[PDB]
Design a binder for these strands. Structure first.
Length: 96
DNA sequence: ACCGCTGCAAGGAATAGGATACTTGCGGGCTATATGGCGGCGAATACCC
């Protein structure tokens, strides 16, 4: 349930999925020391079960997805586009 | 040496005719309340925290 879909109960917690082994502890990302837990976004449809074997690079879950003279005029005039593809302002990790 | 008379002006009724006060349209001279276009953008409010 997205933040909008869910009621007040589940607002605080953040759903996630950590890769684990038979021992139960969190298997680590290769190379680095950040434990591998993937943050499930809202409206994510899941089909697999808990504690079930899966292989590398597999679908853990699914989440669905002018040219005329005015184009030249707009491009030179440097007008802001309708739907700006916001960029990454600086380097580093990101959070909500 | 006095008087009634004739006669010569002043005011009434009928016609023609110009002068002149009155009326009018103008010509120039003057003064002094809408209703089928968008797009961009920036400033100025509105708003609900």
């Amino acid at each position: 349930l997205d933040s909008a879909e869910r009621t007040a109960g589940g607002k605080d917690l953040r759903p996630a999925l950590k890769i684990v082994d038979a021992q139960g502890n969190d298997v680590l990302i290769p190379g680095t020391d950040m434990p591998a837990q993937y943050f499930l976004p809202g409206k994510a449809i899941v089909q697999l079960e808990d504690g079930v074997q899966i292989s590398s690079g597999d679908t853990l879950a699914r989440i669905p997805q002018t040219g005329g003279l005015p184009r030249v005029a707009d491009l030179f005039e440097a007008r802001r586009p309708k739907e700006p593809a916001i960029l990454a302002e600086i380097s580093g990790i990101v959070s909500f």
